[PDB]
Amino acid sequence: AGTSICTSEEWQGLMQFTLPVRLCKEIELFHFDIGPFENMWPGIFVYMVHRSCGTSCFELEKLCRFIMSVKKNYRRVPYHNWKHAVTVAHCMYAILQNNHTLFTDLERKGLLIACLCHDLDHRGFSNSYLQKFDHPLAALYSTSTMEQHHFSQTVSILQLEGHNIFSTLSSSEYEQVLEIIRKAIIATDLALYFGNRKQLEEMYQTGSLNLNNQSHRDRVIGLMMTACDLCSVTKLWPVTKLTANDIYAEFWAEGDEMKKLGIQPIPMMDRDKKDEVPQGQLGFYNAVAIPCYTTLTQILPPTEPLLKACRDNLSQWEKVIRGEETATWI
Ligand SMILES: Nc1nc(=S)[nH]c2[nH]ncc12
Numbered sequence: 001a002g003t004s005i006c007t008s009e010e011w012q013g014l015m016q017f018t019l020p021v022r023l024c025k026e027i028e029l030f031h032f033d034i035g036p037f038e039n040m041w042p043g044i045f046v047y048m049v050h051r052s053c054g055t056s057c058f059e060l061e062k063l064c065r066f067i068m069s070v071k072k073n074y075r076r077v078p079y080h081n082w083k084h085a086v087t088v089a090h091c092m093y094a095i096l097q098n099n100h101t102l103f104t105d106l107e108r109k110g111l112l113i114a115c116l117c118h119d120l121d122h123r124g125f126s127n128s129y130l131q132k133f134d135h136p137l138a139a140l141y142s143t144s145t146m147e148q149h150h151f152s153q154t155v156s157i158l159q160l161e162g163h164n165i166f167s168t169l170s171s172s173e174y175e176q177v178l179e180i181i182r183k184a185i186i187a188t189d190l191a192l193y194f195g196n197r198k199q200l201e202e203m204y205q206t207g208s209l210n211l212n213n214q215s216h217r218d219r220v221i222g223l224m225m226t227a228c229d230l231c232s233v234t235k236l237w238p239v240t241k242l243t244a245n246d247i248y249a250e251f252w253a254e255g256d257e258m259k260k261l262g263i264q265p266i267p268m269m270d271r272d273k274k275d276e277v278p279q280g281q282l283g284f285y286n287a288v289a290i291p292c293y294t295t296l297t298q299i300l301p302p303t304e305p306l307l308k309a310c311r312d313n314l315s316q317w318e319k320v321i322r323g324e325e326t327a328t329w330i
């Protein structure tokens, strides 16, 4: 019920935060894992915004309020949580640093914010679930149900007193960045990814792709959003494997709810079908992750390390299937 707001202590603490110097170098790399630095997550996001956009891009007090209120509006769910938000924003930072002048100042600030916000107030349930059981959100948002909600949550937080980091934009640029953010969040609906990637692949392969064309830019930004959202598959194997445990914790909890409503869940969401997980991961990588990073690398060549890491993880799932897995901790 309603939008949560950070405390004075929370945002003033972020304002005074300083990032250890050794991490500065590490944060630039695609494979960086925020996992071991939880106390530093909000500060890491400030650092990224300041490196990409400038220390004066946002009023610091508004930015710190905004960040700490965003954190407070992620729920304590196993996967679609604050840690996921900051991970996705970091991937976007790495993409932006490596492709910096392809994107306008307004796009960079909008996309880093969109990434931080893109799963706001997620409940640990899929679009499939909300629509199957006619949750009020599915009535309000007929397609891309949760993503429309995440964008609405974003605008609610911006509207809190002292939280509007974009107020100093011209009236025109303000409308433009909100549209950047809306499009980017909606693009995180994997339903839309399949069509988007196929279109981009064609535009790329025929040579019609043109970044001066707004609809092309929109689609490229779309694919960047998918690549950042799925970036757990681009980390080192043990990190990827641990994150998969969190994703499946959510999936199995949803499947449990469907059993109670008289419907057998898809196997992926069935905690009594964990034997099918390795094959399911293979399916996901071949159908979703590999094509995403393949097309992204064609369009943005500096992103190739995402693709190489994704391929390496695909090989690991293949090893799991062949019974070659070694010791794992969870
Ligand atoms: N298998 C999957 N892995 C990730 S990171 N996300 C997913 N969404 N749906 C399936 C999966």
Ligand code: NI
Pocket: 118, 119, 146, 188
């Ligand atoms: Ni999402």
Ligand code: NI
Pocket: 084, 088, 118, 119, 188, 229
């Ligand atoms: Ni997400």
